């Protein structure tokens, strides 16, 4: 009945000289244990500053290379070449200390406040606190200040709170498990957390990322967090912050900046599993138009395929000629089309894709032969997306399909990879039967369950055991590559399975949620989480994927979902239909809220630009704007779009009001500028929320450029700009507008076919000035964009050109590309 492990001692350690300081230590195992398998006797330990704001701690086997995420998959700077050894840099707020105890320890603290960020000092009689390092069990633990540390992240899991609750285990093992299930490991793995400290120095935030693709359990008990990882190495990154936005900037610098999205992807999307034929999807499109509900993109689920085979069309229900006609008509109406692809290729002798796949040997193998799964068409082989040959095959299959049927984007699903059967384990393999069982599906379920077995092999003799969590991520890279090679437009793809870095390639949606009030709320923490994960294009299936929706739930869901960065109504086939036009109350709400969303299109687009530039999420937690307000840390039912717009949805059946938190200051309803909330300090306010209404407020100190409502994003972009200026007594109001053609591949690139406008507004005693600065005037000028109206909120006196009131300045006819300074006088 042994102890789990006995820990390590420092045998030597030095800080290098004359270079960007790094520390190298050699660690020797104290004593062996049989628990969880063979202990690595010698460890190479390094701490180094890859940037002034980013500390990297890398623990490897001193005597053997171990699995690491390939640099080609996630490119990053290479590794560097009692008694304590201390590492610190003059311009870094991070200080690293190696404790030569028995067993050894290490900490990282803030120079500026002495707050301990990460504390891996062992409690010597408590092996659960030790660094343990076995071939299939790595243990790394940090103490935390229970009440000061507020943690977020470690996806993908459905949770009723955004801030991680104390006393839980979060399992990371990509699995086809429905997101309507709380707690369970879902489709993606993001071993990142944000840690917002309420003191010392309120709002002081850092990030912690373990760059490891193996299955893991992360145990969080409030005063401790422990990683239990079944392979690979410890490659840990600490991001200094100190604001939450800085942390995401630092994190996305490492894992990849969010891919831009095309302008059209912010329009409304409609999909259903079960659409019967071309006539039905044409009918859906028509009825959206007839209801005057904006619809941008029509999607087809696996119904369109011939017997669920990728790259085919059902000759009876979705014939090529009628589908070609249908897509052409979409395109003539300013609309777009996105079909689904699964990764498994049906083992069918008449099937061209299968033939070319076999000819190029593109499939993942087990025991020397292609691994046989079961998915929608039955038997399948899975392309090895780690194999360059398979990626070329994928590009080719997509090019062939695109040649016959125009598409505007791709939805990649089932890519955990999902398998409908579980294969028998390889006798004697500790990969198929690992010594430590992670909490797969909340029941310590074997990792091979409903996926590709761990003993399957990939390109370069890589085991599925090691590469499993990378599959969806790899398919996303290959698919974005295929789209970029077959069209010069900025591509759009949506992926189910993801890993840290996936945001550089793809949007994500929350997966198989349910038509439940619980899931309506769950969409908010998941939306916020994916922003932290560097995947700002996130949304949930509006009205619920699984189970039949109700009129009321669907009405409250479109109200909320109209503000997701990715807004799509999708549903399972064994449920009632849930297109937005089916109920009048839903249709009316849809027009109102999609109306406002569409007016906000230039704003969403600008946020998408900021996200690609800095990693800052489009939909962000309140504490991103108000990190000094501790009350916002625990909020899980409100969120911001950009800096100053707050969405506060009703999330309860039968409710006609919502208790919503308002940070200090003046907030104005975007649906009625006369309606406002003014609070001298942050507090809950019981907002009226009639059946047809959702609360959406803008804070003082912000300026938002809007365009008009329209049925398509193209038509919306042809309308005048109206500037909404919300004055603050305390600060000048500012805002930003990024403009390009909506589809440029290199957003904000040196070609300069874009413009960036900054808006400013400041009150004097007797006057008010509103002005803009323009980058690349000639370009914006060439696009004829006109700002015709400015609405001024936040003041108690009316204003004119040479309780709160609203002032509107009309008929300006101002070119957006020409900087202006507008001077106003108080009445
Ligand atoms: C459409 C959908 O179909 C598959 O998923 C189904 C699944 O086959 C159903 O059996 C059902 O599974 C639930 C199960 O009923 C529920 O009890 C729960 O099981 C828990 C269990 O409760 C708990 O005790 C513990 O044991 O863990 C279990 C889970 O591990 O949860 C199950 C699901 O995890 O519902 C799901 C979801 O409907 C298939 O696997 C899905 O991928 C598939 N969805 C895909 C397919 C599409 C068609 O192309 C798309 O339309 C869709 O967007 C895409 O996500
Ligand atoms: C190989 O491709 C065939 C042609 O697409 C598949 O047959 C088709 O399956 C449909 C059910 O999804 C069925 O409605 C079609 O009538 C049928 N077409 C023909 C020409 O037979 C075939 O699918 C298998 O066979 C059918 C009869 C069903 O039993 C499916 O469940 C089977 O998977 C494909 N073969 C395989 C092994 O997938
Ligand atoms: C926008 O919000 C305003 C603030 O609640 C509404 O004004 C209010 O209207 C009430 C009558 O419905 C009235 O008792 C309140 O005193 C009044 N409050 C203020 C500050 O004016 C406004 O409601 C009206 O809109 C239409 C329906 C007309 O009745 C106008 O006279 C009001 O401005 C809200 N606007 C809309 C369009 O709902």
Least Cα distance to 462 among 65, 60, 14, 18 occurs for 65
Mutation pick for ligand 1 pocket among 171, 174, 177, 178 (CB with most ligand atoms within 8 Å)? 178
Provide the resolution (angstroms): 1.8
Residue 544 CA to ligand 3 centre (angstroms): 34
- Token pair for residue 653? 């059946």
User: Phi/psi at 253 (nearest 5 deg)?
Assistant: -65, -35
Asked if 512 is an active-site residue, the reply is yes
Mutation pick for ligand 3 pocket among 671, 674, 687 (CB with most ligand atoms within 8 Å)? 674
Q: Which ligand is nearest to the CA of 673?
A: 3
Helices (H), 256-378: 278-290, 320-332, 352-359
Spatial separation of the C-alpha atoms in residues 115 and 121, rounded to whole Å? 15
- Token pair for residue 688? 């009226």
Residue 682 CA to ligand 3 centre (angstroms): 26
Active-site option among 93, 301, 512, 541: 512
Shortest-distance Cα residue to atom 35 of ligand 1? 178
Ligand 1 in reach of 305 Cβ (< 6 A): no
Ligand 1 in reach of 340 Cβ (< 6 A): yes
Active-site option among 39, 93, 413, 464: 413
- Residue 395's Cβ-side half-sphere holds a number of Cα atoms within 13 Å equal to 16
Which residue ranges form the domains of the chain, and what is each CATH number? 1-257 (2.60.40.1760), 258-599 (3.20.20.80), 600-700 (2.60.40.1180), 701-827 (2.60.40.1180)
Residue 179 CA to ligand 1 centre (angstroms): 9
Residue 422 CA to ligand 1 centre (angstroms): 15
Least Cα distance to 233 among 302, 137, 169, 325 occurs for 137
* Cβ 578 vs Cβ 551: under 8 Å: no
Q: Which ligand is nearest to the CA of 308?
A: 2
- Residue 630's Cβ-side half-sphere holds a number of Cα atoms within 13 Å equal to 11
Shortest-distance Cα residue to atom 18 of ligand 3? 674
| Three-state DSSP state, 22 | strand
Alpha-carbon radius of gyration of the chain: 27
Spatial separation of the C-alpha atoms in residues 381 and 354, rounded to whole Å? 9
Identify the H or E element spanning 463.
strand 462-463
Question: Which residues make Cβ contacts (< 8 Å) with residue 13, sequence separation at least 6?
Answer: 23, 24, 25, 26, 45, 85, 98, 100
* Cβ 500 vs Cβ 157: under 8 Å: no
| Three-state DSSP state, 604 | helix
Ligand 1 in reach of 418 Cβ (< 6 A): yes
Any residues with Cβ below 6 Å from ligand 3, and which? Answer: 672, 674-675
Length of the chain: 827
- Token pair for residue 738? 């990024």
Identify the H or E element spanning 596.
helix 584-599
* Cβ 624 vs Cβ 244: under 8 Å: yes
Residue 670 CA to ligand 3 centre (angstroms): 14
User: Phi/psi at 823 (nearest 5 deg)?
Assistant: -110, 130
Residue 181 CA to ligand 1 centre (angstroms): 9
Spatial separation of the C-alpha atoms in residues 203 and 241, rounded to whole Å? 10
According to DSSP, residue 500 is labeled T
Atom of ligand 2 nearest to the CA of 377: 38
According to DSSP, residue 80 is labeled P
Least Cα distance to 196 among 512, 509, 638, 620 occurs for 620
Helices (H), 47-143: none
Shortest-distance Cα residue to atom 33 of ligand 2? 378
Angle between helix 244-255 and helix 601-614 axes, rounded to 10 deg: 70
Spatial separation of the C-alpha atoms in residues 208 and 164, rounded to whole Å? 14
Question: Which residues make Cβ contacts (< 8 Å) with residue 764, sequence separation at least 6?
Answer: none
Strands (DSSP E) contained in 41-80 are: 42-51, 54-61
Ligand 1 in reach of 572 Cβ (< 6 A): yes
Least Cα distance to 207 among 230, 223, 190 occurs for 190
What approach was used to elucidate this structure? X-ray
Identify the H or E element spanning 734.
strand 733-740
Find where tokens 């490891």 sit. Answer: 212
Q: Which ligand is nearest to the CA of 670?
A: 3
- Token pair for residue 574? 């064994």
Least Cα distance to 731 among 813, 799, 807, 643 occurs for 643
Residue 306 CA to ligand 1 centre (angstroms): 23
Spatial separation of the C-alpha atoms in residues 801 and 769, rounded to whole Å? 10
Any residues with Cβ below 6 Å from ligand 2, and which? Answer: 306-307, 346, 348, 377-379
Find where tokens 């045998």 sit. Answer: 11
């Amino acid at each position: 009945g042994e102890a789990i492990g006995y820990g390590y001692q420092v045998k030597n350690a030095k800080v290098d000289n004359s270079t960007g300081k790094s520390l190298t230590a050699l660690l020797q195992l104290i004593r062996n244990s049989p628990v969880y398998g063979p202990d690595i006797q010698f460890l190479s330990f390094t701490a180094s500053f890859e940037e002034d704001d980013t500390l990297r701690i890398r623990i490897t086997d001193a005597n053997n290379r171990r699995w690491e995420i390939p640099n080609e998959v996630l490119p990053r700077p290479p590794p560097p070449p009692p008694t304590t050894t201390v590492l610190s840099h003059p311009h870094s707020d991070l200080v690293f200390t190696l404790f030569h105890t028995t067993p050894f320890g290490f900490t990282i603290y803030r120079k500026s406040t002495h707050d301990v960020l990460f504390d891996a000092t062992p409690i010597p009689s408590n092996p659960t606190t030790f660094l343990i390092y076995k071939d299939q069990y790595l243990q790394l633990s940090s103490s935390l200040p229970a009440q000061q540390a507020h943690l977020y992240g470690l996806g993908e899991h459905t949770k009723p709170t955004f801030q991680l609750a104390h006393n839980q285990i979060l399992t990371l093992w990509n699995a086809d498990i429905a997101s309507f299930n709380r707690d369970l490991n879902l489709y993606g793995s993001h071993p990142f957390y944000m840690d917002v400290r309420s003191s010392p120095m309120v709002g002081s935030t850092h990030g912690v990322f373990l760059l490891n693709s193996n299955g893991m359990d992360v145990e969080y008990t409030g005063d401790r967090i422990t990683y239990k990882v079944i392979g690979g190495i410890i490659d840990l990154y600490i991001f200094a912050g100190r604001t939450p936005e800085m942390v995401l900037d630092q994190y996305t610098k490492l894992i990849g900046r969010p891919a831009p999205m095309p302008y059209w992807a912010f329009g409304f999307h409609q999909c259903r599993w079960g659409y019967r034929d071309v006539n039905e999807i044409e009918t859906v499109v028509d009825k959206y138009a007839e209801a005057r509900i904006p619809l941008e993109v029509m999607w087809t689920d696996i119904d369109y395929m011939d017997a669920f085979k990728d790259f085919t069309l059902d000759p009876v229900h979705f014939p090529l000629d009628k589908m070609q006609q249908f897509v052409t008509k979409l395109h003539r109406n300013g609309q777009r089309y996105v079909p689904i692809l699964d990764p498994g290729i049906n083992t069918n002798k008449s099937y061209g894709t299968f033939i070319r796949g076999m000819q190029s040997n593109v499939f993942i193998k087990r025991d020397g032969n292609p691994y046989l799964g079961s998915v929608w068409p039955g038997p399948v082989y899975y392309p090895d997306f780690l194999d360059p040959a398979a990626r070329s095959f994928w590009v080719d299959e997509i090019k062939r399909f695109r040649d016959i049927l125009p598409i505007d984007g791709i939805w990649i699903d089932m890519n955990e990879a999902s398998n409908f059967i579980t294969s028998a384990p390889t006798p004697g393999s500790t990969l198929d039967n690992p010594p430590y069982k992670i909490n797969n599906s909340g029941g310590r379920v074997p990792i091979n369950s409903k996926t590709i077995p761990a003993t399957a092999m990939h390109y370069g003799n890589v085991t599925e055991y090691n590469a499993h969590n990378l599959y969806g991520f790899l398919e996303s890279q290959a698919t974005r590559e295929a789209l970029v090679r077959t069209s010069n437009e900025r591509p759009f793809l949506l992926s189910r399975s993801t890993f840290a870095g996936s945001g550089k390639y793809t949007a994500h949606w929350t997966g198989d949620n349910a038509a439940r009030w619980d899931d309506l709320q769950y969409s908010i923490p998941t939306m916020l989480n994916f922003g932290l994960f560097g995947m700002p294009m996130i949304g949930a299936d509006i009205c619920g994927f699984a189970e039949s929706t109700t009129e009321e739930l669907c009405r409250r869901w479109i109200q909320l979902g109209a503000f997701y960065p990715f807004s799509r109504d999708h549903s399972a086939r064994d449920t009632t239909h849930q297109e937005l036009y089916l109920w009048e109350s839903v249709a009316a709400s849809a027009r109102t809220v999609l109306g406002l969303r569409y007016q906000l299109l230039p704003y969403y687009y600008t946020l998408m630009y900021d996200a690609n530039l800095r990693g800052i999420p489009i939909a962000r937690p309140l504490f991103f704007t108000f990190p000094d307000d501790v009350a916002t840390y625990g909020i899980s039912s409100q969120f911001l779009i950009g800096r100053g717009i707050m969405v506060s949805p009703v999330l309860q059946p039968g409710a006609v009001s919502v208790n919503a938190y308002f940070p200090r200051g003046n907030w104005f309803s975007l649906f009625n500028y006369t309606s406002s909330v003014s609070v001298s300090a942050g507090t809950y306010v019981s907002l009226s929320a009639p059946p047809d209404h959702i609360n959406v407020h803008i804070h003082e100190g912000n300026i938002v450029a809007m365009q008009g409502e329209a049925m398509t994003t193209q038509a919306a972009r042809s309308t005048p700009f109206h500037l909404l200026v919300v004055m603050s007594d305390h600060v000048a109001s500012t805002g930003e507008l990024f403009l390009d053609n909506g589809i440029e591949m290199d957003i904000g690139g040196p070609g300069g076919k874009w413009t960036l406008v900054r808006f400013f507004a400041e009150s004097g005693i007797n006057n008010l000035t509103i002005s803009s600065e323009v980058v690349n005037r000639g370009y914006a000028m060439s696009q004829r964009w006109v700002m015709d109206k400015i609405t001024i909120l936040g003041l108690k006196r009316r204003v004119r050109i040479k309780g709160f009131v609203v002032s509107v300045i009309s008929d300006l006819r101002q070119l957006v590309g020409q900087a202006f300074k507008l001077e106003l006088e108080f009445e």
